[PDB]
Amino acid sequence: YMESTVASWYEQGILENIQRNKLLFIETQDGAETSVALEKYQEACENGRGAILLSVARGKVSEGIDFVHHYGRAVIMFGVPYVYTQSRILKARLEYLRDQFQIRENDFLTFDAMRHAAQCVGRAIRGKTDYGLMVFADKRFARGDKRGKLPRWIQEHLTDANLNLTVDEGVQVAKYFLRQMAQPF
Amino acid sequence: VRLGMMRHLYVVVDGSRTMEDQDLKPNRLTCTLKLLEYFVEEYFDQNPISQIGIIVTKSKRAEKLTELSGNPRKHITSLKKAVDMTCHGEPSLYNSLSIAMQTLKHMPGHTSREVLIIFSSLTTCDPSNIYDLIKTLKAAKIRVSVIGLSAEVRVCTVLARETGGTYHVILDESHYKELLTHHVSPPPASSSSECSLIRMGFPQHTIASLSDQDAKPSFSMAEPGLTLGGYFCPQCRAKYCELPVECKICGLTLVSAPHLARSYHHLFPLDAFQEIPLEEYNGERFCYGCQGELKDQHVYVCAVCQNVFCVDCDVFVHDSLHCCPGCIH
Amino acid sequence: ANKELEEKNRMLQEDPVLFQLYKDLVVSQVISAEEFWANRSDIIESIFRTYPAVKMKYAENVPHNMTEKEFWTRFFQENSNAAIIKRFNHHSAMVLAAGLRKIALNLKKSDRYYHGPTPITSQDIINSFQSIRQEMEAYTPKLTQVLSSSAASSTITALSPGGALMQGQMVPNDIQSELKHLYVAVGELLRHFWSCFPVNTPFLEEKVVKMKSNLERFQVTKLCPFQEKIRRQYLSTNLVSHIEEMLQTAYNKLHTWQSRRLMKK
Amino acid sequence: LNLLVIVVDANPIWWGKQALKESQFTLSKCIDAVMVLGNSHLFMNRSNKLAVIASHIQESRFLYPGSKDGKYELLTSANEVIVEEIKDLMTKSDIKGQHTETLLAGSLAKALCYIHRMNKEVKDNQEMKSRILVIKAAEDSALQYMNFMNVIFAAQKQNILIDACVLDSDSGLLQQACDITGGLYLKVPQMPSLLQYLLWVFLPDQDQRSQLILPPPVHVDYRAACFCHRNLIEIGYVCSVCLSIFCNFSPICTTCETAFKIS
Amino acid sequence: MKLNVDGLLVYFPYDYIYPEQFSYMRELKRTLDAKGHGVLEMPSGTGKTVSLLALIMAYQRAYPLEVTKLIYCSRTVPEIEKVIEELRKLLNFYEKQEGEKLPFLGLAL
Numbered sequence A: 001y002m003e004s005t006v007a008s009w010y011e012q013g014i015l016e017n018i019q020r021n022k023l024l025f026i027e028t029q030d031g032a033e034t035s036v037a038l039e040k041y042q043e044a045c046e047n048g049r050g051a052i053l054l055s056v057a058r059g060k061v062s063e064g065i066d067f068v069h070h071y072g073r074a075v076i077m078f079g080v081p082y083v084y085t086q087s088r089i090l091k092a093r094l095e096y097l098r099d100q101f102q103i104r105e106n107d108f109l110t111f112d113a114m115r116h117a118a119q120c121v122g123r124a125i126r127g128k129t130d131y132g133l134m135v136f137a138d139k140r141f142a143r144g145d146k147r148g149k150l151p152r153w154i155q156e157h158l159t160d161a162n163l164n165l166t167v168d169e170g171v172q173v174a175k176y177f178l179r180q181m182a183q184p185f
Numbered sequence B: 001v002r003l004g005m006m007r008h009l010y011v012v013v014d015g016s017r018t019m020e021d022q023d024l025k026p027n028r029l030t031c032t033l034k035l036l037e038y039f040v041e042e043y044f045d046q047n048p049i050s051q052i053g054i055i056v057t058k059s060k061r062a063e064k065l066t067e068l069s070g071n072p073r074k075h076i077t078s079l080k081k082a083v084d085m086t087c088h089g090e091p092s093l094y095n096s097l098s099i100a101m102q103t104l105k106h107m108p109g110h111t112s113r114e115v116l117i118i119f120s121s122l123t124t125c126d127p128s129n130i131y132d133l134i135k136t137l138k139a140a141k142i143r144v145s146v147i148g149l150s151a152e153v154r155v156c157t158v159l160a161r162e163t164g165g166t167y168h169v170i171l172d173e174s175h176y177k178e179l180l181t182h183h184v185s186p187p188p189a190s191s192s193s194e195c196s197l198i199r200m201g202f203p204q205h206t207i208a209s210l211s212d213q214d215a216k217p218s219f220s221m222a223e224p225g226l227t228l229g230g231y232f233c234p235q236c237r238a239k240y241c242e243l244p245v246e247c248k249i250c251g252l253t254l255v256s257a258p259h260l261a262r263s264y265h266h267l268f269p270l271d272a273f274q275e276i277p278l279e280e281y282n283g284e285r286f287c288y289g290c291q292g293e294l295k296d297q298h299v300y301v302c303a304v305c306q307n308v309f310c311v312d313c314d315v316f317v318h319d320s321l322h323c324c325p326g327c328i329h
Numbered sequence C: 001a002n003k004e005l006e007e008k009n010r011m012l013q014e015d016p017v018l019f020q021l022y023k024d025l026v027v028s029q030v031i032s033a034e035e036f037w038a039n040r041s042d043i044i045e046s047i048f049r050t051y052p053a054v055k056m057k058y059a060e061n062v063p064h065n066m067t068e069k070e071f072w073t074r075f076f077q078e079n080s081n082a083a084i085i086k087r088f089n090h091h092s093a094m095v096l097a098a099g100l101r102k103i104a105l106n107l108k109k110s111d112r113y114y115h116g117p118t119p120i121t122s123q124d125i126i127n128s129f130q131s132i133r134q135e136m137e138a139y140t141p142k143l144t145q146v147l148s149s150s151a152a153s154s155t156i157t158a159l160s161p162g163g164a165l166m167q168g169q170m171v172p173n174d175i176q177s178e179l180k181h182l183y184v185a186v187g188e189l190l191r192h193f194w195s196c197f198p199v200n201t202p203f204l205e206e207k208v209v210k211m212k213s214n215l216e217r218f219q220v221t222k223l224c225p226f227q228e229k230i231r232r233q234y235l236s237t238n239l240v241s242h243i244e245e246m247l248q249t250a251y252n253k254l255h256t257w258q259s260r261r262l263m264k265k
Numbered sequence D: 001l002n003l004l005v006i007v008v009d010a011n012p013i014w015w016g017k018q019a020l021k022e023s024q025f026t027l028s029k030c031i032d033a034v035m036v037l038g039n040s041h042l043f044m045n046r047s048n049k050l051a052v053i054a055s056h057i058q059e060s061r062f063l064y065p066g067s068k069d070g071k072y073e074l075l076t077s078a079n080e081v082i083v084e085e086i087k088d089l090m091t092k093s094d095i096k097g098q099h100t101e102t103l104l105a106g107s108l109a110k111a112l113c114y115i116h117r118m119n120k121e122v123k124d125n126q127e128m129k130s131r132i133l134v135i136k137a138a139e140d141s142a143l144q145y146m147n148f149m150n151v152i153f154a155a156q157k158q159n160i161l162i163d164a165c166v167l168d169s170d171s172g173l174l175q176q177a178c179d180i181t182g183g184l185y186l187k188v189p190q191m192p193s194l195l196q197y198l199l200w201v202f203l204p205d206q207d208q209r210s211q212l213i214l215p216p217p218v219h220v221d222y223r224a225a226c227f228c229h230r231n232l233i234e235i236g237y238v239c240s241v242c243l244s245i246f247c248n249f250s251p252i253c254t255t256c257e258t259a260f261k262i263s
Numbered sequence E: 001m002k003l004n005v006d007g008l009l010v011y012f013p014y015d016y017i018y019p020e021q022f023s024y025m026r027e028l029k030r031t032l033d034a035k036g037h038g039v040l041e042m043p044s045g046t047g048k049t050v051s052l053l054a055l056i057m058a059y060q061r062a063y064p065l066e067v068t069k070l071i072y073c074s075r076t077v078p079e080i081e082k083v084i085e086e087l088r089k090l091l092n093f094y095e096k097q098e099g100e101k102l103p104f105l106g107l108a109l
């Protein structure tokens, strides 16, 4: 899915404009390339060029890496993280949970998505009270079930006013929030 | 707290594309230039001995819009000309800081070299890494205090804190005014800062000796017509139209006594007057400062003269007059 | 390399004033010109710095029986899907690599400011105080006492242009440019002559250049008075004496500092 | 409109010296002339307003915040209030031999903040062009230079014209003061005929001052001196902290105590 | 910074703790007192380690027989290195407070 989206953006002019605005780095299955790309991403973050690191939620990089101040400032989540519905291993794992312990298949699937999203979006608040915003570009997260299964600390901060902001409104509120966080305590 | 009276300041303006965005009520670049005109005039009015220089950076290249000078009008004209600048390209902190460093490297040690980067586009495309340039900046003791716009840039944060300057982000236009007005005042001298005596020259206005006898005709020194009288120099002996100005030959600053006197209030800051809302046995209806009835439940008093001042009196005294009227007595 | 010749060719006609003054220093054969200087697309470039492969290809395929339009055409030209991601990763890495080249103050005397640079019995106060206290027991004499016609007329006559308190030529135009040019020349040479004059510079290699510049002062002031003579013998009006003061004061500084150096020796 | 402020230097020592001398000119006549000038200023237009301040060695006091003789009520009130207050101030005054020099910087500071208060209160629709018609009458004090310079620069920034009208003495500090803000400087040598000078040189406002012939400004000697001597010096050696004009190069300036490093 | 926790007194190296830290410590002490397995969540990536370690050490001092030792597991070795750094800082703080070495051992496999 990441490759398809990247290819579509490349065919259109959006990707070139993104490249002009800020440097772009992408993740690959190979660990060597992943490590090199992340090493360059850190230097880009240190410098004023900036960087946009595209990765996969299940990618080992997402779990291994930790984002701190001036690292992964704004965490973008493109789509709810769901595993493919064809891998037969998950079919056993899921239908057995339905049969025993009485967990609905949809319930467990949404839980597996929300837990993974929280894992991959909770890094920006590592410590030392370093500001940062987590934007989820998916109307599915706006659903009550996803919000309810979301961790309490994120959900309570989340409000109905900004729950389903348009793209432009989200950009404006992000700019304003960054303004507020820029100033000292 | 030691203060550096004489400071050579460079206001680095970025002609980035992001300046096109009209986040403020008018165009961002136009607003910045319009307010920076006021900043320049006020800076010269609050530090005559100091001088300023503007570097405009766009399309990854930095150009000196106006070299160091003591004439606010020339810089104001440069600002008005730049108002119409195309505003296309990408800035380069390395290029801008390198130009500023090249010009400020040969400046005297006693004066405080300062840079105020009005950063608009968060991106910084530079030919070379700026962390290396940070080391040279620290070695050269050039203070750099960035003012970011709509972004808390990490590289500029480290720049400011490491080099000794301060980092800020614009909350709004009113706060932008406050930020620049605050930066107007001389910064305190730190441990790295050093002070040294500087040669100074005081010219006297001169005119025709007696009925244009043995006159001293001359045109100017930086379409000037003949001038019957004007300022001169102890050493250049070259006519100067306006003061204060650096010598074009000596290299010595020419400046009159009032210009120096204008900066004594910095050495003598006024202690804040405690604000007491209640009357506190103040039976004088008329405010001593303005001889007007106190229409609000507010009073200000010194620790020496123990006089009474209203809100307007205290605000004006601490803002512009920089001295207590009655407490002068 | 003839870098000096290249710079001279570049500035020969681009800047008029610089070359005008540099030539003027030689027009009368004042001094050698050596001391003068001794003392004082985007897309292709971006690709050039971006792709080292393109740099090597350009070096090997330098135009030879081909055309730059064809070279431009050659630019744009799951296996392909992964190639795009790899290409962005490599291209961003290349861009980044190209950008990455290998005291509280205390004082003891404050009244000095209260009386800055501006420069400057007992029973008399009592007498004056009592007399002034008794002065104004009568008020509002404005009807006649404040002013009188004779005094008013005297005041108006004084305010007249010939009176007290009120004291009360652009004929040449072409001479203005010549005077400006001469002043610019004087400034240009006085700049180097005064560059290190104020500093003592008690070193042999430092003092050599001040000695040479001091001789150059004589040599330039040798030719200045001839142009002065040419200008003077026109009308004997609107004397230009300010130029003389600069030369005489420079000479006075030179001779006084020479005497001081001899005294120090 | 125009807000005029008359800063009268009514120094009891000097004016009483005149009284003892029994000279033709007297403080009563000076006050009457100032009163006539203020009355004429308000006479110019309704929107115009005025105020008066009197200077004394101790402090400075404001002299100004029916038709019995067929008089304009407002000007009658002005006459009565100024006469009563000036008589009260002159009659009541403590004696202090230590301090006798006339105080002017504090009075000017009061005038400046008063003008600021009036500018704040007045409606934004009408623009106010304030002016300060300082009338000195005695020699200035050396110790007041710093504060007087502060107030002069504040006036320059706030766009108020200090029109000096020194008489019987030429205060270099005051002429320097008015030169900075561009105010006129007139030295009347005929004290009895002073009011004619006011109704010509000072009375016209800044609006019409440019389009009018007035006495040329007096040359200002912007002298500098070292803190040793108080003598004129053309070259000053200031430091980066004191900003003080000194005599000659020294290892360390006394007013600084800084650890200057030779070179 | 000695916190008078409801169960006992617990040392803490940093100057201040947020109310969520108080809640975390009290809930954790409740679980240890019940001596029953449980699960809890804390937002901060860092700070939870120090609070947890301090509470466990204080509980060990109060009831050494109740808990034989602490087995603190982390996802990855690079991450567990930060945990051992936090534990070293806490031990240095506690050693300074006590004035002498105590029979406490802590290590990473």
Ligand SMILES: [Zn+2]
Pocket: B233, B234, B235, B236, B237, B247, B248, B249, B250, B251, B252
């Ligand atoms: Zn000079």
Ligand SMILES: [Zn+2]
Pocket: B287, B288, B289, B290, B291, B292, B309, B310, B311, B312, B313, B314
């Ligand atoms: Zn008041």
Ligand SMILES: [Zn+2]
Pocket: B302, B303, B304, B305, B306, B307, B324, B325, B326, B327, B328
């Ligand atoms: Zn006071």
Ligand SMILES: [Zn+2]
Pocket: D239, D240, D241, D242, D243, D253, D255, D256, D257, D258
């Ligand atoms: Zn000093």
